[PDB]
Amino acid sequence: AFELSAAEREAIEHEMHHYEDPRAASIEALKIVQKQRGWVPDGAIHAIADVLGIPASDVEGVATFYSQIFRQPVGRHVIRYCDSVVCHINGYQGIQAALEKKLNIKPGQTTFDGRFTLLPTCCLGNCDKGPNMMIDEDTHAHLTPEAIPELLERYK
Amino acid sequence: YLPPRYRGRIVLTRDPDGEERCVACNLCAVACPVGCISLQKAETKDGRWYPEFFRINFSRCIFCGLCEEACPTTAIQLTPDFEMGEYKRQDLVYEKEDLLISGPGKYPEYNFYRMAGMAIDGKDKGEAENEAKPIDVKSLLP
Amino acid sequence: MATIHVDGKEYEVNGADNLLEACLSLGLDIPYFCWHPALGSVGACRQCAVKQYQNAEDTRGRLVMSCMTPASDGTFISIDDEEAKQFRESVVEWLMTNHPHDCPVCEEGGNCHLQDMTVMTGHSFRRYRFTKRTHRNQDLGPFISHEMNRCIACYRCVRYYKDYADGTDLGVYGAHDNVYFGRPEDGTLESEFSGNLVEICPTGVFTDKTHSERYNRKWDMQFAPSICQQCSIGCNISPGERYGELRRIENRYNGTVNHYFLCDRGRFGYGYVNLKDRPRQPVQRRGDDFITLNAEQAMQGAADILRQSKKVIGIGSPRASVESNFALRELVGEENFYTGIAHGEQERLQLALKVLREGGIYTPALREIESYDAVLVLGEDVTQTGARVALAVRQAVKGKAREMAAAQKVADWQIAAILNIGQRAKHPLFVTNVDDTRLDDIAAWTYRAPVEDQARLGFAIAHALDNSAPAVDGIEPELQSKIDVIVQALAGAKKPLIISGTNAGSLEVIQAAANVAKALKGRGADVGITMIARSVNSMGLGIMGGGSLEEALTELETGRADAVVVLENDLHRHASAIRVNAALAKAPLVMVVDHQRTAIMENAHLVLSAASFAESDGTVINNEGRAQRFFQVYDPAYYDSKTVMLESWRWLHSLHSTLLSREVDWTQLDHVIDAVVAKIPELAGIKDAAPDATFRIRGQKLAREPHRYSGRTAMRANISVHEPRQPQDIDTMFTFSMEGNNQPTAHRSQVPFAWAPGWNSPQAWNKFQDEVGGKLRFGDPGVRLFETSENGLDYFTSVPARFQPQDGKWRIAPYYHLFGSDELSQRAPVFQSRMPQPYIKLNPADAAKLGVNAGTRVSFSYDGNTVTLPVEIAEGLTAGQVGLPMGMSGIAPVLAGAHLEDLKEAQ
Amino acid sequence: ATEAGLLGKNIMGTGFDFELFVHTGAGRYICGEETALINSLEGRRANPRSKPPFPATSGAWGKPTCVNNVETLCNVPAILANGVEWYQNISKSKDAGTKLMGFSGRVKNPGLWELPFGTTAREILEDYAGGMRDGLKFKAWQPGGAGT
Ligand SMILES: Cc1cc2nc3c(=O)[nH]c(=O)nc-3n(C[C@H](O)[C@H](O)[C@H](O)COP(=O)(O)O)c2cc1C
Ligand code: SF4
Ligand code: SF4
Ligand code: SF4
Ligand code: SF4
Ligand code: SF4
Ligand code: FES
Ligand code: FES
Ligand SMILES: [Ca+2]
């Protein structure tokens, strides 16, 4: 039973002013809805489409293409660990193994209570500063397996 | 005494699970030089292609075996049995109930649907040979 | 224009073309997937790779894509270069890694472009040992099945559906090797042109669901060149038959009319041929008992009673051929021949004919529509009636982006560059209807109004274009502002198109459209006009003429007509059912010659088993005025020996000879056409539409069956093991066999099906064209009956008064549906679910005055009858009007423009 | 900068009116490709475009467009403020100006240092990055990221 809220709708129409076409606001509109609800539900695809004046198959095409826009329910805190080449040399596999022991899940899966979802991600742009991970909008560098339980405790 | 490769009576065989092996692909009918095979495709509610009718005119048949080698399911095979004879030429026309035997014949183990991507009962998507599980476009993993 | 060097040889090609369409026109086989002649080049599949050198002395060059490379003067390319051949084989190898082992149970098998290109590259050995990716499927409705595992990601489906056809509910999802083509969720594909996806997709992802019920391979099909019978556009089709039943409908390329695309009503509305209720033998009534007669008995029996009658009248049909109506006209005489359509429908059709023949404005062909710069659509809901014109109008609206790109020196085939330059800029399109149309997404302005108000806007545009045109007093300033917008776009256009039609049910709308075209013709514009008619041979029956059906019913109930020969007509659509059933009961002898089972054959005294278009030959005249020949697909007597299905012209000619001299005459088709030409000068062009039955390709007859047709000694072996003789065709140049000619370079215009060595798919049509995407090599079939007149007409001064609602009386606003409004195709079982529920559409203010809402069953009265329908709510419908679905079971199309005296809630 | 008059309309009294925007991405590497950046900016799936035409003529919304890296744009104030002659004579090499060069991996001092062109890789590895960590030998190096 999806409805666009009156503040999400005003935020989408705020960014339609900054482009020639309202089609250009589609990425930000998906991120606006996901920021409020954790993920983009199925009824939000038709909701965003009718506001922007583009077909729903165009909105769904964009949302499935982009990795960060989520079309499946996630946890309260998303853990995104780097698995690219410089983090592979600095020991990401030990970080991945420590994350799979504290959480008792596999990447792509959420925890049973729904607190955390574990996802691999590309290079975060922090390659010189060691193995890297992100929890929500927070970047943690110089990762060690011993640091994994204390770091996770902050996010409840 | 007949060798195993003897080209006598034409039968249709069955799967080791017990279903008819013919998927009504019509390759045997077109590869026959004499034009002695007629068949029509039917489809179950499960989605399995099977022949609605299968008709071989044995008066015209020359027992060349081009139908057997055309078949991509091993359903149609030529058996060592030459014992045929009739008073009427109309009784040389064999229907599917005169051709479908109880087992797999010369090739005991081959099942075509295990290879095929198409989904029928007992084999959903990703349950075929050398086939991975379907990944949805909405999946969180990149 | 340009000269290129290919593999050492030298050729002359068009410079504007790219290298793939240049080399395919010369007969050089290059494999390809993502390119289409209609859709343009995008460069995705990388299959069309050739090696390009800088000059004649450069020995080591580079691999380019021939669909993306211009054929400039001085080009040096090598198709057969070893590095190019290895790469082209690798592209097929990469596509074969994830392809399922599905060819025996794939409906595309034997007609698969991927199968042809795999063999053509010469890749036959698998090296890949890993797992294959799989996809789940969607439900896409009753017409198209979905199997995403077979997809090769060529992007042809989305480029056709969104870019070309302007559909909104198909897209591409995902990324990398997990790309998914389909809908966002399951459900019916909403586009009226969805069914072209089965030809457009080079694999078996999108396949015909109506053909997969009774599937057969392409080599087992019997094909004939035929014409679509579902509306007046005249799309060329190639129907295929196996075991005495029509199996699928294929597009038959015609570079003048339809080219690569059909509509969904044409493609999927063929199921009425395959009904078990059709009459197969002549049937004569004896009180309550029914007697079955053979052809000789039926003719002698009918002409005994017809000799004793004092006056015989004949009722023709718009869905009957020109040879069938003329034979009926020859049997009763031209003074006793009636057209079978109502007087008001007759009046709109002859006025539509008058402006085409005498207006002095050229009427464009269906592909010529795509070159026009402005389109005004007056009254014709063209997507629901004449659907291929709406597809052609969408391409005309995209001409603005092609003009901008040409100024920036972007090539015509580089479609993604042209679309990027465009950015929603459109040629102006102005449509008028009673409600919203499916052209509203691309229309510059939509005008929802009653039909007199649509005509009054049409006369005011003509008066604002020319001072001599009559004026419309009483126009408000709000409408006056919009009229100036339309007039500045029309007068500023270099090539405007005016579209109207008879389906609006108003004489004044057709009169308003001729005034706009006349006012633009006086300004110096190269103006075209298009009128859409109702049925396949509406224009042909109008050229022949005759009295209206209402006059015929008068001659029955006033005693003067002793007998009536109804030809392929269900009279309920054209006139009141109670009047028809009463007037056919007073007649001593009623004879019906129809291929379909109709309600008026219950009390009929003699029924003749007429043939449908699949089992008949004849000429139909489309909305443009082009006479086109359709050929018989199959002999229905071959499988069932009791079947006495003859052509309508063959039944009526034989009856006339038995009436004169007591001897039956089963005539030939060319003798009937010759008889038409002598008596009717206006139908003289039909002789040249197709050659006669003595036409040969070096002594060979044109083949109906592919050369690898199977089962000759087993098809009929369950009835008799003795093979029967092959059916002999004396009417046409075609043979009911595979022993004939279907060469791509044969000097002919009528091509039954396309097949070439190494090209088993619909891509084999490239071998039959002069240039790919052009015309057929020796000319497209069909001839225009009339040329543009030297002088035009006068201005029509019959301006209607403004529409006013009345208390009690409700005007009936016509609503048309592609899957319900046509007589034959609504009897197809696959159309029963695609058609909507019967409804009644009301303005919100009028439903508030009536006290009803959406879903309430409401009762009304037409002609003393009572029909109850559930209410639907229409905001764009103006008050005083009532929306009805035309041409359904119960709602005749004669009801358009009628009045409903009483309307109240059902109890 | 919008309240000091360095952005918006009538910047520094001249007729020039420029309005700057920041729009964050949704996470695909192909969005860094310049024609696919234009499609991502337009709100489409980030496919690249075929060249020709170039974005200088037909770019974002079919308008003339220029796409430049962040570090390319940051060199431009140095050139205009100091002069064309200063920038040419920074290094005596065929590549002009300074570059952000660095070493990452299991090295003693991973980091980033602004250096002119023509600096050798060994100088970056052994003087700036401090060489390999103790107990590690040098096997191979990629000069410019993952695509090299
Ligand atoms: C796959 C791919 C990814 C790219 N990613 C980036 C990128 O992240 N940042 C960037 O500045 N250029 C990237 N580029 C290069 C751009 O396409 C383009 O050449 C560059 O932005 C031009 O700007 P410049 O002249 O300042 O270097 C990428 C190119 C490719 C082919
Ligand atoms: S017998 Fe074999 S070749 Fe013939 S239709 Fe059946 S599966 Fe196809
Ligand atoms: S053995 Fe030869 S002739 Fe007999 S059915 Fe098979 S292919 Fe036809
Ligand atoms: S799409 Fe073509 S290649 Fe693929 S299974 Fe069907 S027939 Fe075979
Ligand atoms: S569904 Fe068919 S047309 Fe569309 S991309 Fe896949 S293979 Fe091409
Ligand atoms: S537009 Fe008319 S003639 Fe053409 S395919 Fe559709 S119904 Fe048939
Ligand atoms: S490779 Fe890990 S952040 Fe760059
Ligand atoms: S056909 Fe040319 S790249 Fe696809
Ligand atoms: Ca005939």
C881: which strand partners? C811
Ligand with smallest separation from the Cα of C206? 5
Question: Which long-range contacts (C-beta less than 8 Å, at least 24 apart) are formed by D54-58?
Answer: D57/C408, D58/C408, D58/C410, D58/C417, D58/C420, D58/C421
Query: At C741, phi and psi to the nearest 5?
Result: -115, 135
- Tokens 């999802």 belong to C173
Q: What angle do CA C196, C69, D28 make, to 5 degrees?
A: 75
Which helix (H) or strand (E) element contains residue D113? strand D111-116
Ligand with smallest separation from the Cα of C249? 6
- Amino acid at residue number C190: E
**Which atom in ligand 8 lies closest to the alpha carbon of residue C43?**
3
What's CA C399's distance to the chain center, in Å? 24
**Which of D11, D1, D58 lies closest to D35, judged by CA?**
D58
User: Nearest Cβ partner of D110 from A18, A28, A128?
Assistant: A128
Distance CA C270, CA C279 (A): 17
Please answer whether residues A135 and A79 qualify as being in contact, where contact means their C-beta atoms are separated by less than 8 angstroms: yes
Distance CA C237, CA C256 (A): 14
Alpha helices in A53-132 (DSSP H): 56-65, 85-89, 92-102
Q: Does the C-beta of A139 come closer than 6 Å to ligand 7? A: no
**Which atom in ligand 3 lies closest to the alpha carbon of residue B68?**
6
Beta pairing, strands C76-78 & C49-53 = antiparallel
Which helix (H) or strand (E) element contains residue C861? strand C857-862
**Which of A49, A73, A50, A52 lies closest to A60, judged by CA?**
A49
Task: Give distance in angstroms: CA of C62 to centre of ligand 5.
Answer: 29
- Nearest C-alpha in A relative to C170: A57
Task: Give distance in angstroms: CA of B142 to centre of ligand 1.
Answer: 22
Superfamily of domain A6-65: NADH-quinone oxidoreductase subunit E (1.10.10.1590)
Calculate the dihedral angle through the C-alpha atoms of C476, C482, C484, C489, rounding to the nearest 10 degrees: -160
Tokens, residue C614 = 């699949």
For residue B63, what is the domain's CATH number?
3.30.70.3270
Looking at the structure of chain B, the number of domains it has is 1
Distance CA C548, CA C564 (A): 14
Q: What is the stated resolution of the deposited model, in angstroms?
A: 2.1
Burial of C495 (0-12, 13-18, 19+ CB in 10 A): middle
What's CA C44's distance to the chain center, in Å? 32
Distance CA C789, CA B80 (A): 79
- Nearest C-alpha in C relative to A46: C184
- Nearest C-alpha in C relative to B51: C215
State the sign of the Cα–Cα–Cα–Cα dihedral B61, B65, B71, B76.
positive
Structural domain includes residue B39: yes
For C30-55, give the secondary structure using H, E and C: CCCCCCECCCEECCCCCCCEEEEECC
Please answer whether residues C531 and C622 qualify as being in contact, where contact means their C-beta atoms are separated by less than 8 angstroms: no
Please answer whether residues C652 and C328 qualify as being in contact, where contact means their C-beta atoms are separated by less than 8 angstroms: yes
| B36 labelled ligand-binding | no
Question: How far from C411 is each of C53, C370, D60, CA to CA, in Å?
Answer: 21, 18, 19
Interchain CB distance below 8 Å, C417 and D45: no
Task: Give distance in angstroms: CA of C687 to centre of ligand 9.
Answer: 17
Task: Give distance in angstroms: CA of C672 to centre of ligand 1.
Answer: 73
Beta pairing, strands C62-65 & C49-53 = antiparallel
Distance CA A97, CA D43 (A): 38
| B71 labelled ligand-binding | yes
State the sign of the Cα–Cα–Cα–Cα dihedral C334, C339, C343, C344.
negative
**Containing structural domain, residue B5:** 1-115
Distance CA B106, CA A68 (A): 56
Task: Give distance in angstroms: CA of C203 to centre of ligand 5.
Answer: 7
- Tokens 């078990």 belong to C276
Kindly state whether A74 is in contact with chain B, defined as any CB-CB distance less than 8 angstroms: yes
What's CA C18's distance to the chain center, in Å? 31
**Which of B31, B33, B51 lies closest to B42, judged by CA?**
B51
Q: Does the C-beta of B100 come closer than 6 Å to ligand 2? A: no
If one residue of C152, C163, C173 were mutated to test the ligand 5 pocket, choosing by the most ligand atoms within 8 A of its CB, it would be: C152
Please answer whether residues C714 and C701 qualify as being in contact, where contact means their C-beta atoms are separated by less than 8 angstroms: no
Distance CA C366, CA C371 (A): 10
First to last CA, chain C: 76
Experimental method for this entry? cryo-EM
Interchain CB distance below 8 Å, A72 and B137: no
Q: Does the C-beta of A134 come closer than 6 Å to ligand 7? A: no
Distance CA C153, CA C130 (A): 20
Structural domain includes residue B142: no
| D66 labelled ligand-binding | yes
Kindly state whether D110 is in contact with chain A, defined as any CB-CB distance less than 8 angstroms: yes
Please answer whether residues C44 and C51 qualify as being in contact, where contact means their C-beta atoms are separated by less than 8 angstroms: no
User: Nearest Cβ partner of C105 from B57, B93, B118?
Assistant: B118
Tokens, residue C352 = 């539509």
Task: Give distance in angstroms: CA of C760 to centre of ligand 4.
Answer: 13
Interchain CB distance below 8 Å, B137 and C105: no
- Amino acid at residue number C805: P
Distance CA C675, CA D10 (A): 84
Its CATH architecture, for the domain C810-905, is Beta Barrel (2.40)
Task: Give distance in angstroms: CA of C202 to centre of ligand 4.
Answer: 9
Please answer whether residues C566 and C590 qualify as being in contact, where contact means their C-beta atoms are separated by less than 8 angstroms: yes
Kindly state whether A65 is in contact with chain C, defined as any CB-CB distance less than 8 angstroms: yes
Distance CA C755, CA C524 (A): 46
Which helix (H) or strand (E) element contains residue C355? helix C343-358
User: Nearest Cβ partner of A57 from C168, C175, C424?
Assistant: C168
Please answer whether residues B16 and B91 qualify as being in contact, where contact means their C-beta atoms are separated by less than 8 angstroms: no
Please answer whether residues C433 and C779 qualify as being in contact, where contact means their C-beta atoms are separated by less than 8 angstroms: no
Interface of B with A (CB under 8 A): 137-142
DSSP assigned state of C99: -
Query: At C240, phi and psi to the nearest 5?
Result: -115, 135
Kindly state whether A57 is in contact with chain B, defined as any CB-CB distance less than 8 angstroms: no
- Nearest C-alpha in A relative to C166: A55
Q: Is C326 left (phi over 0), alpha (psi -120 to 50) or beta?
A: alpha
Please answer whether residues C618 and C630 qualify as being in contact, where contact means their C-beta atoms are separated by less than 8 angstroms: yes
Q: E strands along C588-644, which residues? A: 589-594, 606-609, 618-621, 626-630
Distance CA C670, CA C750 (A): 17
Distance CA A91, CA C265 (A): 63
Interchain CB distance below 8 Å, A86 and D104: yes
**Which of C807, C683, C704, C905 lies closest to C238, judged by CA?**
C704
Alpha helices in C240-292 (DSSP H): 264-268
Question: How far from C267 is each of A61, C261, C345, C628, C631, CA to CA, in Å?
Answer: 29, 10, 27, 19, 18
Ligand 3 atom 7: the closest Cα is on which residue? Answer: B32
Please answer whether residues C48 and C31 qualify as being in contact, where contact means their C-beta atoms are separated by less than 8 angstroms: yes
Kindly state whether A119 is in contact with chain B, defined as any CB-CB distance less than 8 angstroms: yes
Query: At B11, phi and psi to the nearest 5?
Result: -125, 165
Kindly provide the b/e burial profile for residues C415-430, where b requires at least 16 CB atoms within 10 angstroms of the residue's own CB: bbbbbbbbeeebbbbb
Distance CA C533, CA C233 (A): 8
**Which atom in ligand 6 lies closest to the alpha carbon of residue C389?**
1
SS3 C143: coil
Residues 6 through 65 of chain B touching chain C, CB cutoff 8 Å: 23, 25-27, 29-30, 32, 34-38, 40-41, 43, 49, 55-57, 59-60
Q: E strands along chain A, which residues? A: 77-82, 116-121, 133-135, 138-140
C445: which strand partners? C430
Query: At C108, phi and psi to the nearest 5?
Result: -80, -10
**Which atom in ligand 4 lies closest to the alpha carbon of residue C203?**
1
- Amino acid at residue number B89: R
User: What is chain B's length?
Assistant: 142
Please answer whether residues A94 and A130 qualify as being in contact, where contact means their C-beta atoms are separated by less than 8 angstroms: no
**DSSP per-residue letters across C798-852:** -PPPPP---SS-EEEEEE--TTTSSTTGGGSTTHHHHSPPP-EEE-HHHHHHHT-
Residues of C in Cβ contact (< 8 Å) with A20: 423
Kindly state whether A62 is in contact with chain C, defined as any CB-CB distance less than 8 angstroms: no
Query: At C5, phi and psi to the nearest 5?
Result: -115, 115
Interchain CB distance below 8 Å, A58 and C424: no
C6: which strand partners? C9, C77
Q: What angle do CA C209, C214, C215 make, to 5 degrees?
A: 80
Alpha helices in C497-647 (DSSP H): 507-522, 538-544, 549-557, 577-583
Q: Does the C-beta of C620 come closer than 6 Å to ligand 6? A: no
Burial of C666 (0-12, 13-18, 19+ CB in 10 A): middle
**DSSP per-residue letters across C418-465:** HHHHHTT----EEEEESS--TTTTT-SEEEE--HHHHHHHHHHHHHHH
**Which of C114, C186, C194 lies closest to C150, judged by CA?**
C114
Kindly state whether C708 is in contact with chain B, defined as any CB-CB distance less than 8 angstroms: yes
C52: which strand partners? C62, C77
- How many CB atoms lie under 10 A from the CB of residue B85? 7
| D15 labelled ligand-binding | no
Distance CA A19, CA B57 (A): 73
B120: which strand partners? B123
Distance CA C494, CA C658 (A): 59
Task: Give distance in angstroms: CA of C43 to centre of ligand 8.
Answer: 5
- Domains of chain A, by residue range, sit at 6-65, 77-152
Q: What angle do CA C898, C901, C903 make, to 5 degrees?
A: 115
Helices (H) and strands (E) in chain B, counts: 4, 5
Residues 67 through 126 of chain B touching chain C, CB cutoff 8 Å: 72-73, 89-90, 92-93, 95, 112, 115-119, 125-126
- Nearest C-alpha in A relative to D44: A62
- CA-based nearest distance B119→chain A, Å: 25
Domain over D98-148 is classified CATH 3.10.20.600: yes
SS3 C374: strand
- Amino acid at residue number C601: M
Superfamily of domain A77-152: Glutaredoxin (3.40.30.10)
Residues whose Cβ atom is located within 5 A of ion ligand 9: C 617, 632, 731
